[PDB]
Structure formats: C-alpha cells, structure tokens
Ligand binder design. Sequence first.
Ligand SMILES: [Ca+2]
Ligand SMILES: [Ca+2]
Lengths: 175, 175
Amino acid sequence: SYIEREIKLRVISPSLEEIEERIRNNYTFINEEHQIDIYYNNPIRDFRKSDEALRLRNTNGKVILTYKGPKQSKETKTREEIEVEVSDLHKMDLILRKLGFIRSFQVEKIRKNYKYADFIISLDSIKELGEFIEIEGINKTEKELISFVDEFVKKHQIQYEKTIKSYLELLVEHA
Amino acid sequence: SYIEREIKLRVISPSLEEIEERIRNNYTFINEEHQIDIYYNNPIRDFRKSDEALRLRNTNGKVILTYKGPKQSKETKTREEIEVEVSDLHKMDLILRKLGFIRSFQVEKIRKNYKYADFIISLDSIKELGEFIEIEGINKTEKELISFVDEFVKKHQIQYEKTIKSYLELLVEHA
Ligand SMILES: [Ca+2]
Ligand SMILES: [Ca+2]
C-alpha cells in the first residue's frame, strides 16, 4: 500500500497529437494503454462521502483491482493506492457483486506514457470528456512534482487547467 | 462462477499414510499442496447466517481469492464457487480490510491430490483437526459421486464418517 502523487491538466491547446510531436524528441515513449475501468460503491459506506474508490481496470488485457484512499492534498492528486493483478475480470466482478458491491460507473480511455528523468507523462484521451495530461514523479516531493509540471507546460507552450478531481468525478460533472 | 461438488470423510482408520500406500498402485499422484487459508466476514451481512464464505488462500505460493455460495445439498458438499488468482496476498488482504472485511479465522493444511478416472481424491491433514479425505468428480452427478465414494472406502477398507461441514465450521466445533 503506498502514496500515488500526480498532477492532472485539462488540455486547452494544442491538441494531444501536437503535444506528442513537441515532446517526441526529448521524452522516451513507454507504451500506449487502452484502459476500461469499472468503478464500484458500497451500499452501506458511500465512497462519495469517504472519498474512496474501488476500481477494476482492463489495460491492454491486464486486469487490475485497485483501492484508492481519500485525497491527502489540495495542490496535487495525492491518495493511498493498493493494486493487485487478478486473473479474470468477469469472475472478480462477479465476486465483488456477490459481496454486495454495485457497479457505479465506467471510464474508458487511451493513455500514451512518456518518461523524462524520473517523471512519467501520460497523454490521456478520455472517451466523452476530452484530452488531459497526467504527470507522476518517481521518489519526488509535492514541490518537485509541481515544479516539473510548471517547466513541462512552459517548455511545450501548453495552455492548460489544473484539477485534483478524478476522471470519474469530472465525467459526472460533464454529464 | 460454477458448482463445486465434493464429499468429505473424517478418517477413523487407517492412517492417511496407510491409505496412500493402499491407493498408490491404482491412483495417479498429482501434487502435494501446503494450503494456508484466511477466511473473512462482512460486518453488516453475517456470512454464518447466509452460509457464504470469502477466502484468501496461499497454496504452494499461489494466491487465490475464492467466494463460496450457500450449500445446495444435504447429501454432499455442494456450493457455488468463484475463484481468481491474485498477484499479492498482503495487498489483497489490505484491500479487503480497507473495504471493511475483517479476518475471521485461519485454516492450515497439507493436501495430497490423487486422480482416478475423472475423480480427484485429496488426502487432507488439517492442522489441529486431524486426517480427512475429500473426493470431487469431474462432470459427475451427485449420484455418481456418492457411488464412487462408497466404492472407494470399501475397496481400501477405510473406516470413516461423512460430513458436509467446512473445515472452518469443524475447527470452531473442535475448539
Ligand atoms: Ca490519474
Ligand atoms: Ca473442500
């Protein structure tokens, strides 16, 4: 179990395609992930109140069960994150439904991952929401992450908007 | 998700070692499993009432999460069983505890698996309970399983007692 710290940017300009072109030369491409996420809720412990999440993700066929704890920051998206790979999404989903969990929502996206000296940049195109960028830092303080993101958006002339909301939260709002 | 049908015998005589010797010649050895099981309960939906179980098993280092549904028979142990392999027992345990599940008990055993023409015989030595045998049938009716077990105990002169109780139930009783 461990802290996941990231900054999320809603992209205003340019397109993510153009941003890929701008970073293509100094950032190393890692992989492209087609991610379909199912989120769950507990009938007797509303997660919306507790700021918790239970997610079953299918990323390029790999199945991941993830618990996310409440946010620990107002400057960045910082939450405790516990993940395990499971063998079958259908059966893990059935087990969750059998235990009383109810499917609350679905989030689908294409994520392109880039690495730059201990930073992971994820160009996210979120089905029905739009184009976003997420940055994470490997062994980095909240101040190091904030500083790198400032340098990142400036170096590549990105118009943007910061948010600590989850894709699930923002998709609700968008609807 | 699918029905698991088995018959469980408490062994009175001879020892399991002797039973291994008696079946060694016509039954094919499969593997030996050191199984440590953690069982869980839901605080607001007592599993003891619903006849359900949630188990996290470590069998020779393989980690399996299993949901068991209520019993469907009085003649054999018949329950719906849904299992998935997970990558980390510690994290799966943490996720369950984070979701509100509480560890209710532990069952530890050595199981030796033997196969005989679509039947799986499991010689079980259960820590603090004693020596048991479980039989399962592959695509077999309750009547085929019952008949084979009768033939099995007779052919190998096994004194025994049948039970549809779970090891968890019997260990409670034994304490
Ligand atoms: Ca994220
Ligand atoms: Ca059994």
